[PDB]
Structure formats: structure tokens, C-alpha cells
Design a protein that fits this description.
This is part of a larger assembly, with chains A (610 residues) and B (588 residues). With 610 residues, chain A is α/β, with parallel strands linked by helices. Chain A is built from 20 helices and 26 strands. The longest helix of chain A has 19 residues, at 61-79. Classes of the chains: A alpha/beta (610), B alpha/beta (588). Strand 10 of chain A pairs antiparallel with strand 7 (159-160) of chain B. The structure holds adenosine-5'-diphosphate (2 copies), magnesium ion (2 copies) and zinc ion (ZN). Chain A binds a DNA duplex (25 and 25 nucleotides) through residues 230-233, 235, 355-357, 364-365, 367-368, 370, 396, 398. Chain B: It comes from Homo sapiens (Human).
Chain lengths: 610, 588
DNA sequence: AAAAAAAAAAAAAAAAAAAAAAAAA
DNA sequence: TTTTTTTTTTTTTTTTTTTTTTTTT
């Protein structure tokens, strides 16, 4: 086959990346070093190096991918034959910019059959992983003969009797299976037209991809679109069943996860080892003005404290739960929106938009196998993440009491007669609230300005009252900030048109009169891994502070507690202190972190009553 | 011979004129654009060669095949020179339409089978686009020979594999068979045509390559197709379920000249005045309300800051008044005039909820999104009459949506945030029914938080006037008798759409300064009035009101396509917000 | 705060339309 | 070998009960 030989030669030449930037040679070194047998190749590279090869690969996926994989196996054999001998086949995944192939399940028309398609969609079905045999081995006790039979990928006869009718006992251990799964993906409800029902498509996942995507996750699947046949039969209808044989599955949450950036982070941490936390917090939500303490507290929510697992298996949560009660138009919902945009695995929700079994996980019947199955609820999905609950007050109290366990111990215990489980929900809850009566009556105690019972207020470690004080100077400042924001226009990209349906950022005068959001994201992500240890002086300081906080004297006349001070408060201090330590890469919770958390708690837990 | 008929079709396509050859150039442009389909007007075919049209009406099945082949050959003759990699000629689907009035579904008796039939209806369900094979290849299992290019019939007509090259040794190779789009729809008789006491009849439509997804359920459609029965390997005896082979679909209900027309319309010195007097001419009075509604229609500008946060640019308006004023009429006009608009009541509408809902199909286990008025009205206007009678769930949903523009729903299946970028125009009556000043500020039961959402709140009254009553009655009688500066509905709607898509303005430094000072003074005055009354007026003023004034200024400057909002438009927006502060302050 | 009525969930049963395999001659 | 009747499976809908939720005293 001249065409196939040419394709393989071109692909091998591409993979032979030493004269060029050495990107794919390094990628092959990566895949061999970490012991995986699938390579991911950016299509943009094929377009940049050979447009004919890229077009052929995209328009005729099957044979081109076969040639590419064979060239990949040859190249890995050349670089190392020992590893290359381990795996029968080396697979390939694609990614990049798919000009016209990038579509959704709705736009997926029969025109793309036998082509390469990079679809984006919401996963609806994930079937059980089954081992599909590819090579069977059968042993005959009578004849002592071991017979191997191959099973080509024809996406059938299984031998049982020898030539002279001697029973064959299959050798399961020596047989070769590849794990295989089928999922059903759907077009994102956001981009689907509001009127008609959702449109979906099947996807078939071989090894290395069987469980790369879980139900109810927004994913991008790159693969080949082909037609399935019916079973043997004299008559057939022109109808054909089409699936997307995936070559790569990726989580669209690129936010979920270089030496230059690491060096930048190290230098930024070491430069001023005192006020990095304040500089970050001030830069947390640039569009919003004021609320320095609230921004500080949120910065602690993003970092979070440190979880403690004792020898007895006891669990002490290391996440920080924050509540923001506010008069109308004080940017609490805007802060929740920012947390959604920035914090990874930030699950939004609203008061009555998630009732009972939807907010937390649920249990149903499979309805096909008759077997009970769990249902990842709104918050169990938010494990190791943030849950932004807006309009918290309007929730039915049943839902509220259905959050205490996840808020405190971070696990949801659900059990019906058939099945029982304790799903992991280690999420930090950021709740927004409009105080009873709509607006905050400063001439009433914060206790009666909040309709929540004492226990739930205890659940929240920090409770911020954000009043709509109109101090004319403060109103002038807020108006200046807002109007400057409303005037801002994107640099160069815009010139008076409308919107269709580095450590430090450049200092604009219309936004400043701070640190980059991307740099802030990277620094926060790296800092979140640090695990500081409390110091003896810090422990004594926090203990004394908690002792006074419980003491009546800590509150003067006409000042009331915004929430009861109990054991949790103490942990909050630690957690908050821990958070402040993580901002400085401290690795040791010194006194500065403890006292900063202490002042934060003192500000949060007492309100002056007029 | 059939070759003669195809030759005549070729002549008709190549030489039909109107000078200009419509179909030759249509083939050129469509094939160059890659459409690979055309829309043949039946009357032109009949006029050029009436015999061809009669044949089509009597024997569509093969005459349409001949026409498609002729169109393919003509397209080759007109666009043969192509770059390497696409020179292979492409078959062409030939949709056909006509001006003939449709025949009622009740007249589709047995005789009309296999004839070309034109019927009206309402599509109540559409299946997903799928694959049907036009050319299949079968390979023998024993001899492994191939019988490539087995012509496949269109429509719901399967095919039987050969028995003799064992017996029945052939299997289909999926990788070698060419298929095309495919879709099945359910067409119900139009409810108007259904007899009084009578069930609505039904029919099954079958689309094809480019007819798939040209309609969505709920469309009022006229279908021209081939009345055909299923052909699947052959007390009711010998009954073959019947269906229509869809060939032509017509869904019932901007040129550069119009772009320049809009440009000159905006340039008029009094464009604002002509627009203000050109929304509810039948309704008498309420000039300020009409100006505010125009501002709402044009909307402000959506801003996304570098941090990613979004500032809504859609104005929200509320109108509290006695039940006498023409405000529901105003909402009906607004929904009829906005480019995208929906009218609904507080408790949703008739079998059409207000806010979106998500449910999982227990059988298919999908995530069905039943769209409420808000999500359907994305990018447009939602006119909520009886806005004070919502349900708690809907009250919270709109509470979130009017500010964030998004409805966040998390069910046992998934979490999601539907995008509802709708401008809310709400109408309502007082709590008691008639606005009585003696209980001023107690005539509204809305919680203070909701009232913050609305950019402007208008208060209407009819407490007393004789001259106004006489003028109103005489004007209504004059309107019913009759039954210039008025931009017609279509022109106004297209102008609104063009302005919204094209022009997004921003404030200027001086305008921002003036608005800042004015807002500071308004806040001071409101605070002082609240202190004097020793109570909190249930109509607050917040930074959200500053955003509202900015949005109104942006809409005023967007009317004129001016990139920057000047001082005069900010002053006008301040006056408009003053006509609602008349309820914020003068009410108490 | 607790009971009465309503609504929704969920699970089990039925129709049924169509494709494939085993038994019969 | 070739038909035929069954077998399934794969969707979809429908009905009863229970549970969950909403409104009233
Ligand atoms: N301190 C502030 N700084 C910047 N913007 C603000 C501030 N207070 C209010 N706003 C503006 O007012 C609007 C109200 O935001 P939102 O949080 O949705 O209302 P609420 O606080 O009542 O939930 C936001 O769009 C925000 O831009
Ligand atoms: N200013 C007005 N100009 C013209 N017609 C009016 C005016 N005010 C009331 N009407 C008429 O009175 C009727 C009542 O109006 P409607 O909008 O139904 O009141 P509501 O909104 O309270 O239901 C309408 O049919 C309208 O034609
Ligand atoms: Mg809010
Ligand atoms: Mg009305
Ligand atoms: Zn043969």
C-alpha cells in the first residue's frame, strides 16, 4: 500500500522531533517514562507541519490513525525497544483547533462519518466497564495443546472443542482482555436552543479511557464518527446506528489543574514575607469596592485550612464555611459569582433551585438491572471544592438541616433499604443571605436580624454582616469605583461595539485610578498544597484569645454576638490561622497568622447595636 | 424515453430566464457555498415545460430522481473546475415549492397515494438526525468478493440482501457505505381546520439530506411531499402504515438598504421623540412611560470586567397602577414589538412555565429542560403581567435571574446555569386594588429586595380629572371609528435589533462625574427623608439604581448609535429616574 | 406547632414494535 | 437448507402506592 506507507513515513518523520523544537520527542519520552501507552497529539502541529497530512487524518480517521499509531510504535521501539515490546499497540489521542469538525451532538450530522470530530457535551450515561476479550488461550487436557485465537476489532466464534472433539478449557489468566465502556454524551443545556429536547450521541471508550469521564460532567471527546452494523440477517433497513469511537476524552474543567511560573511564585512569596496575604485579598475581586475583611475571609476560603485525621480515624474538617448577610446591593452575589469564576470545582446554586435530594446526593433504582444506584448531588460533586449558595435564607428548613453533616464533617450519609453509603463531600460552603425584613435593622440585635437558628449559625465559622451604610464619603468612593468600572473597555479589541449574545497586571487608570487573576490562580493553587504546623507560641496565643472570646468581658455594652462562640470557633481560629500561613508559604503557623485570624474573628463575631 | 425527460429537465435548469437565468446562477452560488441543494419553484417548471410539472404531480418518485440527476449534471457543467481534493461531483437534493393552496389533511384518501401532495399542519415532534444509507457495499463471507454501489431507495423502504453469491453469505461493511441525514416528524392537523366535534388527524413526515432540522416542534408548516407507504419486506389485513416523503417545507408564522435606512433614522435630531411617540400611538398619554419603555427596549450594554464578572445591560421596568390604565395593552405591544419577546403572567402562562425547569426522563434518563418564559426570552424582553402574584419558587428564581441574568438549577442529576438575559417589564396593581395616598408606601407588598432589582418603578393614578376623562373617552371612540412620524412595527423591530447587535456605548468622563454628583445627592436626600419619616421607605435607592441610570443613559446613546453617552442623555436618564423617585420620595 | 389535603417520586405492569435465534420439516 | 414461531430487548407509557410537600387551624 503506497498510500499507507507514505502516511506512516510522514507520521514517523513528524514524531522524529529533534531538528525541530523537540516537543513530541519529549512527549514520547514522557509517555515512556511514566508508563503509559497512549499519546496525545495537537492537530495544530499537524496543520503547521503538513496540511495534507492533517486534512487526511481529519477526513479519513480510521486508516490514518492506524498508520499514525504504527509509526508511534515504531518510534517508541527506536527510542526504547524494551518498553515498546511490553505493549501490543500504542494508541493516539488528538486535540487542538478542529476548524469545522468541532461541533455538538446537535450539530453532529452524517456528513462527519469516518472523520475526526472534537465534540463538547454533558455526560449523561456511563455504562459499567466490561473486559472485551481480544485474544483467547485454550488448553486441552487430553492433547496437552494450548491454542491461541485472535479477535480483531470488528466494531466471533469462541472455540470449545478440539479438532477431534477434545474439550478445551479456556485460560483466563493467559487470555488478553481490554477494558471497554460506552457512554452517552449530550449537548450542554446552556448552548442548546431553549425549545426542543436535548440531542445526544454515543461514545465508545477503549482502554486508557474507560473511566476518564464520570456521569454528569462537562467533557470534550475527540474521536472518529462511524456507523455500526446490524446483526446477520437477510433483510436490512437503510438505517444505521452511529457512535463516536473516542481517541481522547478530556475534562472541560481545564481550570481543575512551567519552571518560569514556579520561580515567579517562589520569588513573590519570599520578597515580602509579611503582607502577601493582604495584597492578595485586596486583589481578590478588583471589580468590587470595599469589604476588606470579607475579601480577606474569602481568600481564606480559597486556601482553606488543613484537615486532621487522627489515629482513631476521627475527622476534623479543614475547610472554612462563610455566610454573608447583607442589605440589598452590597455585592454579595457578585462575590459569589467571582468565587464561581475563579475557585476550581465551584458549584453554584440558589435557594429553591436545589430541593432536598438534588442539593445533596440521592439514591434511585437503575430501572434496568433493578439495582439501586447512587446519584451525585449538587454538593458531592463539589468535593475538594466550593459550593456557592445564593439566596440561602429562602431555602426550606429541611434542605438547611440536610447540610449540617457535610458542612461539619464533610460526608453525606444516604441509605435506603437496598443500599447504603457515606459519600465524600469535603466542600466549603459560601452562602449569601438577605436578612429578615429585607433590609438590616441596625436598631435590632444581629440575632433577631437573622432568622437562622443558633446551631446553623454555629455551623458557619465566619458570619459577615455587610450593611448598606450610605456615608457620603463612602458613597462617593463606591460610585467612583463603579462608574470607572462601567466605563472600562477592553484594550484595543473593542472600539465602541457591543458584546455578542505576569505577577502584576498593567496599571490602567480606569481600573486603578494588584496581581493578575491567572497569576493569583496559580499561586493559590500551589499554596493550597502547603501543610503548616501550629507553633507553641501560636497555640498559646490562640488559646488565650478563645478564652477571652468566650468570656463575657470580651463584649462591651450594646455590642451583640453575631454568632455563638463555641468549640468550633476555636477550630476556626486555627483554620483561619492555617489559611493565613498558607498564603505566605510559611509551613509553620507563626504568631502573625494567629493574630490576623484573631482580629478577623473578633471583627466577625461582634456587631455594635445602635 | 427517461433520458429525454432528463434532457428536458436539463434544458429547463440551464435556460429558464427571468434578464437572468435564476436556476443556473442558483446552482453556481449554492455549489460554491457547498449547499449542494436548490429550491425549484413548481410554477416556473410548469410554465417552461408544463408536461414536466404534470409528470411530477402524477409520478413524483422517478421524475424527481431525473430532475436531481439533471441538476447534478448542470451543476457540474457550471462549476466543474475545482481545486484538487474536492473535484468529485456532489449529488444535489432538489427541494420543490409552489404557490398552490394546500389541501386539507382530510382529503388525503387512498387515491392520492404516490402523488405529490401539499398539506398544512403543526409539527408536534421531531426525531434526531440519523444515518440512512444511500449506497451500501456487501461482502461475501465465503468468497470475500464485493458488490459495491448497491443503489438504495429513499424513504422508509429497506432492502433485502442477496441470497446467492453458502446461501446468504453477504454482510454489510459500515466503513464503505455512504449515508445521508435522516429524520422523522409527526404532523398534526391545524386546530382551526379540525371539525368542531372531532379528533385531529395525523401524518408522519420523512425528511432528507438538507430537510432535516429545518423545522422544530411547534412550527406551523406547509409540506409538499410524496404520499407513500412503508416498504419493509411486506383484524386489519393488507394495511401498510402511510407517511409523507417530505420534499418542500415552508414554515408559516437585513439588506444594506435597510441598514442605511436605520443609519439615517438614528441621525435625526429628534430620533428619541419619534421613537417615543411610535410605540403605543393608540394608547393616550403617559409620554414619560413610553420614553422609559423605549429605553428598556434598546437596553444598556452588558459589561464583563477583566475579572470575569458581568454587569447586566438589560433594563428592568415596573409599573404599579390602578386596573384602569392601559398597561396590559402596553405589555402586549412591547412583546409584539421587541425583536425577541414573550408575554406571560405572574404564575407563568397556560402550560408554559415562567422559569426554566430540569427533569430527568426516567426511561431515557436524559436531562430534559422545560423552558420557561425567561429562558425562551433570552436576549429579549419578558412582559410579566400580574407580577405581584408569583409563586415562591418562581419569586426566588426571578430574584436571582433579574440581577445575574442566569438561572442556576441543580437537580438530582446535574448542576447547571441556564443563560436568561431577558429584560423584565412588569405590571401590577396596588395591594388594595386602588392606590390610596392615605396608606402611601403601604400599597406595595413587594419585599424591599425585589424592588431593588427594577431599574425604574412607575406609579399610575386615576384619582381625579374631568378633562382627561373626556379626552380619553373621545380618543378611544376615535380609535374605534378609524380602526407622520410613526415607525411601523416591523421597521421599528428591525431597527431595535440592528441597534442592539451593532452599537454598544460607554459613558464619558464628564457624564460619569455628573451622574456621580447627582447620585450622591439622591442618596443623601433619600437617607434624610427616611430619617425624617422614622421609617424605611419600601422603595430603596442603591448602587443598583446608579447602574440603572447608567443603563438608561447607555440606551439613550445607543438609540443614536453614538459610541459615547453624553451629558444630555445622562440628564434625560436622570429625569426618567426622577419620575420614579417621585414614588421613592414624594410618595412618603 | 401539628394535621389534612395535594403533589410529586418512584416502582411495578402493560403495550408493542422490531431484530435475531432455535426448532421443524 | 429454508422457513417460521418464538425470544428478547429495547422504548415507551401507564397505574398504584408511597412518600414528600403545601396549606390551614
Ligand atoms: N461596594 C461595591 N463595590 C462595587 N460594586 C458594587 C458595590 N455594591 C454594589 N455594587 C454593585 O451593585 C450590584 C448589586 O450586586 P448584587 O450582589 O447582585 O446585589 P445584592 O448584593 O443585593 O445581592 C452589583 O452589580 C455591583 O456591581
Ligand atoms: N390611555 C389609554 N389610551 C387608550 N386606551 C386605553 C387607555 N387606558 C385604557 N385604555 C383601554 O382600557 C382597557 C383596559 O386596559 P388594560 O391594559 O386591560 O388594563 P389592565 O392592564 O389594568 O388590565 C384596554 O382595552 C385599553 O384599550
Ligand atoms: Mg443577591
Ligand atoms: Mg391587567
Ligand atoms: Zn460468495
Amino acid at each position: 500500500d503506497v498510500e499507507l506507507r507514505e502516511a506512516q513515513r510522514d507520521y514517523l518523520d513528524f514524531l522524529d522531533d529533534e531538528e525541530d523544537q523537540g516537543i513530541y520527542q519529549s512527549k514520547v519520552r514522557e509517555l515512556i517514562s511514566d508508563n503509559q501507552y497512549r499519546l496525545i497529539v495537537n492537530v495544530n502541529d499537524l496543520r503547521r507541519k503538513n496540511e495534507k497530512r492533517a486534512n487526511r487524518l481529519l477526513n479519513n480517521a480510521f486508516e490514518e490513525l492506524v498508520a499514525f499509531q504504527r509509526a508511534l510504535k515504531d518510534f517508541v521501539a527506536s527510542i526504547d525497544a524494551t518498553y515498546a515490546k511490553q505493549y501490543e499497540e500504542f494508541y493516539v489521542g488528538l486535540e487542538g483547533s478542529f476548524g469545522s469538525k468541532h461541533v455538538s451532538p446537535r450539530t453532529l450530522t452524517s456528513c462527519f462519518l469516518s472523520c475526526v470530530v472534537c465534540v463538547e457535551g454533558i455526560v449523561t450515561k456511563c455504562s459499567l466497564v466490561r473486559p472485551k476479550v481480544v485474544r483467547s488461550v485454550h488448553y486441552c487436557p487430553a492433547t496437552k495443546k494450548t491454542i491461541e485465537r485472535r479477535y480483531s476489532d470488528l466494531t466471533s466464534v469462541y472455540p470449545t472443542k478440539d479438532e477431534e472433539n477434545n474439550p478445551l478449557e479456556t485460560e483466563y489468566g493467559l487470555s488478553v482482555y481490554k477494558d471497554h465502556q460506552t457512554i452517552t454524551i449530550q449537548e450542554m443545556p446552556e448552548k442548546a436552543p431553549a425549545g426542543q429536547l436535548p440531542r445526544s450521541v454515543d461514545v465508545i471508550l477503549d482502554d486508557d479511557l474507560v473511566d476518564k469521564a464520570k456521569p454528569g460532567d462537562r467533557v470534550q471527546v475527540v474521536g472518529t464518527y462511524r456507523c455500526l452494523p446490524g446483526k446477520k440477517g437477510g433483510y436490512t433497513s437503510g438505517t444505521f446506528r452511529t457512535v463516536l469511537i473516542a481517541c481522547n476524552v478530556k475534562q472541560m474543567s481545564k481550570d481543575a489543574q512551567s519552571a518560569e511560573d514556579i520561580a515567579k511564585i517562589k520569588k513573590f512569596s519570599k520578597t515580602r514575607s509579611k503582607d502577601i496575604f493582604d495584597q492578595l485579598a485586596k486583589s481578590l475581586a478588583p471589580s468590587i469596592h470595599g469589604h476588606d475583611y470579607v475579601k480577606k475571609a474569602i481568600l481564606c476560603l480559597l486556601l482553606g485550612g488543613v484537615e486532621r485525621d487522627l489515629e482513631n480515624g476521627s475527622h476534623i474538617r479543614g475547610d472554612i464555611n462563610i455566610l454573608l448577610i447583607g442589605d440589598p446591593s452590597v455585592a454579595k452575589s457578585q462575590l459569589l459569582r467571582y468565587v464561581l469564576c475563579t475557585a476550581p470545582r465551584a458549584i453554584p446554586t440558589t435557594g429553591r433551585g436545589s430541593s432536598g435530594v438534588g442539593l445533596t446526593a440521592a439514591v434511585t433504582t437503575d430501572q434496568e438491572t433493578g439495582e439501586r444506584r447512587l446519584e451525585a448531588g449538587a454538593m458531592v460533586l463539589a468535593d475538594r471544592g466550593v459550593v456557592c449558595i445564593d439566596e440561602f435564607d429562602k431555602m426550606s428548613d429541611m434542605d438547611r438541616t440536610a447540610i449540617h453533616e457535610v458542612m461539619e464533617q464533610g460526608r453525606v450519609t444516604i441509605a435506603k433499604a437496598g443500599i447504603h453509603a457515606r459519600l465524600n463531600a469535603r466542600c466549603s460552603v459560601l452562602a449569601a443571605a438577605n436578612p429578615v425584613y429585607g433590609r438590616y435593622d441596625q436598631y435590632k440585635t444581629p440575632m433577631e436580624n437573622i432568622g437562622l437558628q443558633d446551631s446553623l449559625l454555629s455551623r458557619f465559622d465566619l458570619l459577615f454582616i455587610m450593611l448598606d451604610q450610605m456615608d457620603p464619603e463612602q458613597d462617593r468612593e463606591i460610585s467612583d469605583h463603579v462608574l470607572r468600572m462601567h466605563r472600562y473597555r477592553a484594550p484595543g479589541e473593542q472600539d465602541g461595539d457591543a458584546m455578542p449574545l505576569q505577577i502584576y497586571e498593567k496599571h490602567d487608570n480606569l481600573l486603578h485610578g494588584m496581581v493578575s487573576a491567572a497569576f493569583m490562580k496559580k499561586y493559590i493553587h500551589v499554596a493550597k498544597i502547603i501543610k503548616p504546623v501550629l507553633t507553641q507560641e501560636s497555640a498559646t496565643y490562640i488559646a488565650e484569645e478563645y478564652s477571652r472570646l468566650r468570656s463575657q468581658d470580651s463584649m462591651s455594652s450594646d455590642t451583640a454576638r453575631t454568632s455563638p462562640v463555641t468549640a468550633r470557633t476555636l477550630e476556626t481560629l486555627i483554620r483561619l490561622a492555617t489559611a493565613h500561613a498558607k498564603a505566605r508559604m510559611s509551613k509553620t503557623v507563626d504568631l502573625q497568622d494567629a493574630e490576623e485570624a484573631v482580629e478577623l474573628v473578633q471583627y466577625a463575631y461582634f456587631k455594635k447595636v445602635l | 424515453r427517461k433520458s429525454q425527460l432528463q434532457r428536458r429537465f436539463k434544458e429547463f435548469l440551464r435556460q429558464y430566464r427571468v434578464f437572468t437565468f435564476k436556476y443556473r446562477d442558483e446552482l453556481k452560488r449554492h455549489y460554491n457555498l457547498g449547499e449542494y441543494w436548490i429550491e425549484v419553484e413548481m410554477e416556473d417548471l410548469a410554465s417552461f415545460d408544463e408536461d414536466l410539472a404534470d409528470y411530477l404531480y402524477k409520478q413524483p418518485a422517478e421524475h424527481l430522481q431525473l430532475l436531481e440527476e439533471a441538476a447534478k449534471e448542470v451543476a457540474d457543467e457550471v462549476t466543474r473546475p475545482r481545486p484538487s481534493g474536492e473535484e468529485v461531483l456532489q449529488d444535489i437534493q432538489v427541494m420543490l415549492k409552489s404557490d398552490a393552496s394546500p389541501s386539507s389533511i382530510r382529503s388525503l384518501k387512498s387515491d392520492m397515494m404516490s402523488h405529490l401532495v401539499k398539506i398544512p399542519g403543526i409539527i408536534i415532534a421531531a426525531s434526531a438526525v440519523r444515518a440512512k444509507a444511500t449506497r451500501i457495499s456487501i461482502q461475501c463471507r465465503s468468497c470475500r468478493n464485493t458488490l459495491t454501489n448497491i443503489a438504495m431507495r429513499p424513504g422508509l423502504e429497506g432492502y433485502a440482501l442477496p441470497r446467492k453469491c453458502p446461501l446468504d453469505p453477504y454482510f454489510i461493511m459500515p466503513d464503505k457505505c455512504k449515508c445521508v441525514d435522516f429524520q422523522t416528524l409527526k404532523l398534526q392537523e391545524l386546530p382551526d381546520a379540525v371539525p368542531h366535534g372531532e379528533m385531529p388527524r395525523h401524518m408522519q413526515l420523512y425528511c432528507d439530506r438538507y430537510l432535516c432540522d429545518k423545522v422544530v416542534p411547534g412550527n406551523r408548516v406547509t409540506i409538499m411531499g410524496i404520499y407513500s407507504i412503508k416498504k419493509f419486506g411486506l383484524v386489519g389485513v393488507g394495511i401498510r402504515s402511510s407517511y409523507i416523503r417530505v420534499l418542500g417545507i415552508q414554515v408559516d408564522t437585513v439588506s444594506p438598504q435597510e441598514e442605511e435606512e436605520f443609519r439615517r433614522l438614528a441621525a435625526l435630531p429628534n430620533v428619541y421623540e419619534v421613537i417615543s411617540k411610535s410605540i403605543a400611538p393608540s394608547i393616550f398619554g403617559g409620554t414619560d412611560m413610553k420614553k422609559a419603555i423605549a429605553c428598556l427596549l434598546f437596553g444598556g450594554s452588558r459589561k464583563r470586567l477583566p475579572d470575569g464578572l458581568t454587569r447586566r445591560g438589560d433594563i428592568n421596568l415596573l409599573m404599579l397602577g390602578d386596573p384602569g390604565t392601559a398597561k396590559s395593552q402596553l405589555l402586549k405591544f412591547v412583546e409584539k414589538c421587541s425583536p425577541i419577546g414573550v408575554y406571560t403572567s405572574g404564575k407563568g402562562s397556560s402550560a408554559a412555565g415562567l422559569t426554566a425547569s430540569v427533569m430527568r426522563d426516567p426511561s431515557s434518563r436524559n436531562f430534559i429542560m422545560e423552558g420557561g418564559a425567561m429562558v425562551l426570552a433570552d436576549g429579549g424582553v419578558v412582559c410579566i403581567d400580574e407580577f405581584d402574584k408569583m409563586r415562591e419558587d418562581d419569586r426566588v428564581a426571578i430574584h436571582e435571574a433579574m440581577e445575574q441574568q442566569t438561572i442556576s438549577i441543580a437537580k438530582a442529576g446535574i448542576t447547571t446555569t441556564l443563560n436568561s438575559r431577558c429584560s423584565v417589564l412588569a405590571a401590577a396593581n396596588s395591594v388594595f386594588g386602588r392606590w390610596d395616598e392615605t396608606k402611601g408606601e403601604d400599597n406595595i407588598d413587594f419585599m424591599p429586595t425585589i424592588l431593588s432589582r427594577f431599574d425604574m418603578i412607575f406609579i399610575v393614578k386615576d384619582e381625579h380629572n374631568e378633562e382627561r376623562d373626556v379626552m380619553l373617552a373621545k380618543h378611544v371612540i376615535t380609535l374605534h371609528v378609524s380602526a407622520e412620524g410613526e415607525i411601523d412595527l416591523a421597521k421599528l423591530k428591525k431597527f431595535i435589533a440592528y441597534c442592539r447587535v451593532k452599537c454598544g456605548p460607554r459613558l464619558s468622563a464628564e457624564a460619569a462625574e455628573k451622574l456621580k454628583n447627582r447620585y450622591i445627592i439622591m442618596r443623601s436626600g433619600a437617607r434624610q427623608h427616611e430619617r425624617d419619616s422614622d421609617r424605611r421607605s419600601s422603595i430603596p435607592i442603591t448602587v443598583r439604581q446608579l447602574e440603572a441610570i447608567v443603563r438608561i443613559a447607555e440606551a439613550l446613546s445607543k438609540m443614536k448609535l453614538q459610541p459615547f453617552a453624553t451629558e444630555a442623555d445622562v440628564e434625560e436618564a436622570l429625569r426618567l429616574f426622577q419620575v420614579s423617585t417621585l414614588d421613592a420620595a414624594l410618595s412618603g
